[PDB]
Every structure is written in C-alpha cells, then in structure tokens.
DNA sequence: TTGGGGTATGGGGCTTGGTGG
DNA sequence: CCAACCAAGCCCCATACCCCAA
C-alpha cells in the first residue's frame, strides 16, 4: 500500500548473468524447458573467468550501497507504527510459506484427513442440491437445513461421523508407525 | 547453516461464508 | 489456532542453478 513501495534488495551476480541470459538462451533454443537451459546458463557461468565474473560481482556490491542508503532513507519517512507493521508483514510472509513447505510434505507423505464433522459429511452430500448464486449462498442453504433437522433424520449422518471416527483412527496408527520407521517420530502427536 | 530471489510454466492450493483434533 | 465440508480462477511455487544477508 505504502509497504508495498519497500526498495527491493538487489540480486546478486549470478542472478544477474542468469537474469541476462536466459532471453538470449530461449532464442536461440526455442524447443527447450527453462530448467534446462538454466541449468545450461549456470554451466556457463562456472566457466566464466573470474576477471569476467568479477565485473557483476562489483556491480552487485555498488547495487547494496544503494539499497543500504535507499532502504534507511525509506524508513526515516515512516512513523513507528508503519515501521512495525513493515516488520510484521515480513514476519508474516515468512511464516506462510513455513506453513505451505509443512503443509505440502504433509499432503506428499499422504497423511491422513482429519475426522469428518456429523455436520461435514451432510455437507459433503447436501451441496450439488442447493440454491444460491456463490459458494456463500450455496451454503446458508444447507445451513439452515442442519437447525431445521432432528434426531430420526440425523442418524445416517452421525454414524458415518462415528464410522470415519474410527477410519482416522486407523489411518492415523498406520500413518504414525509408517513415519517411525521413516525415521521421523516429530511428525507424532503429543 | 539456511533460504530467497532472477525465469517460465506445468501441476499444485489458497482464498469466503457459518464444528471438530 | 487451525482443519473440515463446497466451488474455481488467480496465488504461489518447485524446478534448473549460485550467492550472500540474516
């Protein structure tokens, strides 16, 4: 917003050359992944003199002076309350790719989904039939459904609840040994 | 010791509304 | 706190590499 106008910290050289090359590459190479011809680009660089290298490594260096000077002349103009709030959105930019890395090993170890709601599983069923423009509509449909149900008409429900409380359970223990021979008893609740 | 940040894109998943480890 | 139930078009990202600031 005002953050959003934070000076960005130069790359360095390598990031530059490859930065540079990577155009020239896919033009002369247009049936070619860029993965491929990165790691090509990165080949050249390893063979590149160190005289040669130099050049960009002098040219990043004078690109954090600035930075330096930019970044602290950036943060005179703000009031502390700004300063913090910078400081947080760092902090909390942070923490959400810890949170998408975790999340994501996760999902490729295959562990199991969490218990089902009695609430969840009528959801799961009740939603291809139900009025409403969004998602957002589409819901209070089957909410109101859920206060106007009873007892005799919330079984069916309930038991698979109760049946999908013993699936994680199951699937829990098996996932949980799997992870102690894997070599990784963090991964175990308490 | 770690990880972010340059590209481009092919598969990934976070978002908006009101019951459960 | 965060995950679960339903969307899907945008948020993000690992991938190929290296390097240096935190």
Same mark, same amino acid.
């Given at each position: 917003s005002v953050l959003a106008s934070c000076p960005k910290k130069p790359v360095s050289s390598y990031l530059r050359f490859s930065k540079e090359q990577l155009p020239?590459?896919?033009?002369?190479?247009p049936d070619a992944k860029t993965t491929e011809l990165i790691r090509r680009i990165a080949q050249r660089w390893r063979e590149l003199p $160190?005289?040669?290298?130099? &050049?960009?490594? $002098?040219a990043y260096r004078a690109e954090w002076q600035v930075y330096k000077e930019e970044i602290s002349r950036f943060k005179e103009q703000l009031t502390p309350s700004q300063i913090m709030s910078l400081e947080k959105e760092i902090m909390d930019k942070h923490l959400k790719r810890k949170a998408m890395?975790?999340?994501? /090993?996760?999902? +490729?170890?295959?562990?199991?989904?969490?218990?089902?709601?009695?609430?969840?599983?009528?959801?799961? /069923?009740?939603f291809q039939e139900?009025?409403? $423009?969004s998602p957002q509509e589409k819901l209070?449909?089957?909410?109101?459904?859920?206060?106007? +149900?009873?007892?005799?008409?919330?079984?069916?429900? &309930?038991? =698979?609840?109760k049946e $999908?409380?013993?699936?994680? =359970?199951?699937?829990?223990?098996?996932? /949980?040994?799997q992870m102690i021979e894997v070599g990784r008893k963090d991964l175990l609740r308490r």
């Open positions: 020239i590459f896919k033009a002369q190479n $160190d005289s040669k290298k130099k &050049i960009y490594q $002098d890395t975790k999340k994501k /090993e996760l999902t +490729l170890l295959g562990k199991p989904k969490r218990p089902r709601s009695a609430y969840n599983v009528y959801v799961a /069923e009740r139900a009025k409403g $423009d209070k449909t089957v909410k109101e459904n859920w206060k106007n +149900l009873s007892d005799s008409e919330k079984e069916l429900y &309930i038991q =698979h609840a $999908d409380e013993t699936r994680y =359970h199951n699937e829990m223990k098996s996932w /949980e040994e």
